[PDB]
Amino acid sequence: LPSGSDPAFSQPKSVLDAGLTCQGASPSSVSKPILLVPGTGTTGPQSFDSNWIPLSTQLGYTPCWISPPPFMLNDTQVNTEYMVNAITALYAGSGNNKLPVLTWSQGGLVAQWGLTFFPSIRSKVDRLMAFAPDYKGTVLAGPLDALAVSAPSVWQQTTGSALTTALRNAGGLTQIVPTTNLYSATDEIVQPQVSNSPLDSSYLFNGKNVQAQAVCGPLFVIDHAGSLTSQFSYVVGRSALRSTTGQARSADYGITDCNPLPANDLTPEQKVAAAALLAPAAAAIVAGPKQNCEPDLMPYARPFAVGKRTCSGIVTP
Ligand SMILES: *[C@@H]1O[C@H](CO)[C@@H](O[C@@H]2O[C@H](CO)[C@@H](O)[C@H](O)[C@H]2NC(C)=O)[C@H](O)[C@H]1NC(C)=O
Structure with missing residues (x-):
């Protein structure tokens, strides 16, 4: 795995700081933070204020x-x-204590890319809980790339991309910190995910890989958004966050938790927003940059x- 010093940032610190926000606290002084990394086409609040922002608060964290x-x-x-x-800031801001990272969709790829190429944060992240992560990208973006309607990050999240190739060759398909990956065979955005094996996009070697259908059966259906918001996802997520091993434990969930509806502890208002989670993302992707x-x-x-090809040409060291 890459070692040594962290690569330099391309963006100024004031810009990077401006992209970080905590509920009811400044990042420089925060109690039990949990860092949430959003999915493609969304902001942090758009991804999580109908789900893991209120749910993590009820577990004792400051989202x-x-x-x-x-x-x-x-x-x-x-x-x-x-x-x-953000990890550097929150680690110091919480009294130099490790903190958990919870992600959705692209957020998981971002987390694993960070852990692979920026060594300094490896001892600052306590554990990773990733919902529907696309470590190997998705084959479904292929036609969008060919139609030239793909945003920069959509190209990179396409299976076979230069970015996903780099992650694999650097050793990034094996967990670096205790990781739990929750995903669904019926995901309509990220595929392939149907084998419940290392071939799936959400799978990490040595990680706790939980394909919903492996627990709940072939008739259990949860989509890309439901992978983050369902009651089943909540039970697995709570297990991962409370676990002494840093990963979700099989003894903590079972058949009775196979509920595809939004998490039970969400208010009626939050449940409505959670059900339509993908709406703002779809709109942002269509209105956003394309190349x-x-x-x-x-x-x-x-x-x-x-040997891979990017905008400027063939990749060479
Ligand atoms: C979007 O991503 C691009 C590519 O990473 C960023 O552009 C680079 O920015 C750094 C710092 O300004 C420059 O040194 C590079 O030459 C730029 N690369 C390209 C291809 O232009 C850009 O800053 C990012 N934009 C936002 C809003 O985050």
Whole structure:
């Protein structure tokens, strides 16, 4: 795995700091923070205020989130700078204590990219709880790329991209901190996810990989948004956050938790917002930036994707 010093940031610190917010606290002084990393086409609040912001609060954490502009549609490598900066800030701001990271969709890819290429945060992240992470990207973005209607981060999240290749070759498909991955075979955004094996996009070696259908059966259906908001997802997430091993425990969930509806502890208002979670994301992607090539890899990642093609040309170290 990459070692040594962290690569330099491309964005100024004041800009990176501006993308971090905590509920009822400044990042410089916060009690038991949990860092939430949003999905493609959303801001932190859009991804989590109908679900894990109120739910993590009820578990004793102070939710904090990053909102890389515009709506996580830009270069995933830059989105990661927001996360690395945030971990550095929240670790110090909480009395030099490790903190958990909880993610949805692209957020999981951002977290794993950060842990792989920025060594300094490895001892600052307590555990990772990723919902519907696309570590190997998704094959469904292929046609959008070919139609030239894909945002920078959509190109990068396409299976076979230079970015996903670099992650794999650097050793990023094995967990770095205790990780739990919750995903669904019926995900309509991230595929392939149907094998319940290392071939799935959400799978990490040595991680606690939980495909919903492996527990609840082939007739259990939860979509991309439901992977984050369902009652089943809540039970697994709570297990991961409370676990002494840093990963969700099988003894903590079962058949009776196979409920696809939004988490029981959410208020009626929060449940309505959670049900329509994907609406703002769909709108942001259609209105957002689009290009006809994958963004170039930063210097620190180039040696791990030699031979791939990005906007500027063929990747060389
Ligand atoms: C979106 O991502 C691009 C590419 O990472 C960022 O552009 C780079 O910014 C740094 C710092 O200004 C420059 O050194 C690079 O030359 C830029 N690269 C390109 C390809 O232009 C850009 O800053 C990001 N935008 C936002 C809003 O985060």
